[PDB]
Write an enzyme that holds these catalytic residues in place. Structure first.
Site, PDB file in Angstrom:
ATOM      1  CB  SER A 199      -1.923  -3.124   2.619  1.00  0.00           C
ATOM      2  OG  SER A 199      -2.482  -2.582   1.298  1.00  0.00           O
ATOM      3  CG  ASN A 224      -5.200  -0.643   6.085  1.00  0.00           C
ATOM      4  OD1 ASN A 224      -6.524  -0.701   5.823  1.00  0.00           O
ATOM      5  ND2 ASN A 224      -4.312  -0.898   5.198  1.00  0.00           N
ATOM      6  CD  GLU A 262      -2.029   5.292   4.607  1.00  0.00           C
ATOM      7  OE1 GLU A 262      -1.938   5.517   5.645  1.00  0.00           O
ATOM      8  OE2 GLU A 262      -2.578   3.771   4.157  1.00  0.00           O
ATOM      9  CG  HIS A 280      -1.007   2.053   1.126  1.00  0.00           C
ATOM     10  ND1 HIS A 280      -1.976   2.079   2.001  1.00  0.00           N
ATOM     11  CD2 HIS A 280      -1.055   0.682   0.652  1.00  0.00           C
ATOM     12  CE1 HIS A 280      -2.536   1.016   2.265  1.00  0.00           C
ATOM     13  NE2 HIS A 280      -1.911   0.077   1.644  1.00  0.00           N
TER      14      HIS A 280
END
Ligand SMILES: NC(=O)c1ccc[n+]([C@@H]2O[C@H](COP(=O)([O-])OP(=O)(O)OC[C@H]3O[C@@H](n4cnc5c(N)ncnc54)[C@H](O)[C@@H]3O)[C@@H](O)[C@H]2O)c1
Ligand SMILES: NC(=O)c1ccc[n+]([C@@H]2O[C@H](COP(=O)([O-])OP(=O)(O)OC[C@H]3O[C@@H](n4cnc5c(N)ncnc54)[C@H](O)[C@@H]3O)[C@@H](O)[C@H]2O)c1
Lengths: 291, 291
Positions: free
Chosen positions: B126, B197, B159, B147
């Site tokens: 991440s 994020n 992702e 992800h």
């Protein structure tokens, strides 16, 4: 404290018409003030139309009761083109007219002279300072921001914006009122954005900035925020729903009150749609194009 | 391209287990790897249950084909304590081990040898740069970011991060793979935070900053975004839920990589907490106390 029963609402558009309906439906005597008796006509019509939409849901299993709800309710709403004469007896004045410092200031400055002593003034401004407005009166202790969210009948949230001059008596009175409206109050300081907008808007722009750099597409960014973050709407839709000019207006405003700040820089891609009348759903097109 | 049939999942942790699971569960033949045997066991045991939870209470119509299904699936999930001895035949390696550049980096440099040709390498990192992990190999055109969001079996987003080096064959390969897991893939460059994020975390900190400033209270901010924004969790709830350390980490990292952006500017309040092992729920105390 004071128990709010009579409520005077100035400005009978989107937000105001909403604050009116709700105040009524929850048993408050409401006077709806605007500029033209015709404005008021249309204003009230819409409120009726909105109440019926709610009635088919709330009393779906008994339309007669539904029809009563709308009548009883809608009757508690009276109108006037001159607030000046219906405020000596009102308990609360909720202002929600044009987002313009000059205009509101004159209004309150004027109303401060007629309203009764115990009367509380509240602005529903999203971007102006509750402090400026309050100081345009000698009633500062009884002035605060009562920030609602559109559509009012649906949004359970309300921000009670206090200035350093607002008394605790005034607040409690406003928090109760809020609850009676069936809404849930959160205490906030007279700071730009209050709580929601300050944390929501900067976020919406970042998503646009991320789109401008080419790191990802609009479609994907929304899908991502919705499925990966659990948001109701992706940032690009959201901006189209709340309207770009609305958002643009707010963002530039903060940007001025602090130009060297990164979070408030103008999104060029965002000044396009605006300068081209692609405001959002209001006008059927923004980042997306609507039917 | 390649039609990912066999899969290797290095790491049996929170994320690994989900990937391993959801994978096999979708026809693929997985292989779970970790360091110890005690570990591999537990991971697979915990899988079973989750499968059953998507069994016992799932499969509304016919309950029967559960303990059968849960076996069919659970039965197609090998297990090794050495990836080197397996990458030999797999065609997709999904890494989800401790979040450490070196550690995560060496493993790849190694597997690049024993690995097969066609085999694709993806990391679930991440906070690291996919580019610098891909250069720990000579397979940069077949190295990409994959992800997933916790809990894998539920969160339906993924992702797909591409390096300027990742090949077109390698992407569509991963996209199809992503889709056959019921997951919905979104593409994104190798930028910090990818999409989610990137748009999520600075907001969480901004929330905390608003609080530190003293403008409002943790509880109010939480009530606000939940009722006004529509979010499932308030920023402080969510933070305590993902871990202050996990979050601290990611932020400091993106901060080094760009210390001039105020977005990444670390929150004292959050360090003060992490500085005394208050990570949130996994400690029973973050911004809130639990039991
Ligand atoms: N709509 C939103 O997204 C939203 C959400 C929260 C708060 N607000 C705030 O609510 C206020 C109004 O927004 P809106 O969307 O309801 O507006 P609007 O444009 O729908 O309507 C404003 C109404 O004010 C009346 N008006 C203007 N000047 C007046 C005056 N001097 N005296 C009496 N009436 C006057 C108009 O005739 C009009 O009907 C603004 O201060 C804004 O910041 C808007
Ligand atoms: N948990 C999240 O919220 C989340 C979401 C997305 C991505 N991630 C990423 O996933 C990775 C792992 O996170 P996690 O939450 O699943 O952690 P975790 O600790 O639950 O799982 C990692 C597993 O790797 C194993 N491991 C450690 N060193 C190893 C080595 N040298 N070789 C083989 N196995 C080894 C551990 O024993 C552990 O079971 C990180 O890179 C992180 O950035 C985490």
């Amino acid at each position: 404290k004071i128990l709010v029963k009579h409520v005077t609402v100035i400005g009978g558009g989107l937000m105001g018409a909403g604050i009116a309906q709700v105040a009524a439906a929850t048993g408050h005597t409401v006077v709806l003030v605007d500029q033209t008796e015709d404005i008021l006509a249309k204003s009230k019509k819409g409120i009726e139309e909105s109440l019926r939409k709610v009635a088919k849901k709330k009393f779906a299993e008994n339309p007669k009761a539904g029809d009563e709800f709308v009548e009883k309710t809608l009757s508690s709403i009276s109108t006037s083109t001159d607030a000046a004469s219906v405020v000596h007896s009102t308990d609360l004045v909720v202002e929600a007219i044009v987002e313009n410092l000059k205009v509101k200031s004159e209004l309150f400055k004027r109303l401060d002279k007629f309203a009764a002593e115990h009367t509380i003034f509240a602005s529903n401004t999203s971007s102006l300072q509750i402090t400026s407005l309050a100081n345009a009166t000698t009633r500062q202790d009884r002035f605060a921001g009562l920030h609602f969210f559109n559509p009012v009948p649906l949004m359970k949230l309300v921000e009670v914006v206090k200035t350093p001059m607002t008394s605790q008596k005034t607040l409690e009175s406003l928090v109760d009122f809020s609850k009676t409206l069936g809404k849930h109050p959160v205490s906030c300081k007279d700071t730009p954005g209050f709580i929601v907008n300050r944390l929501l808007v900067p976020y919406l722009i970042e998503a646009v900035r991320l789109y401008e750099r080419g790191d990802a597409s609009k479609e994907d960014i929304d899908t991502a925020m919705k499925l990966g973050a659990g948001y109701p709407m992706g940032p690009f839709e959201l901006l189209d729903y709340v309207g770009l000019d609305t958002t643009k207006f707010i963002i530039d405003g903060w940007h001025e009150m602090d130009s060297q700040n990164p979070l408030f820089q103008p999104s060029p891609a965002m000044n396009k749609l605006v300068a081209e009348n692609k405001f959002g759903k209001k006008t059927g097109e923004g980042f997306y194009k609507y039917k």
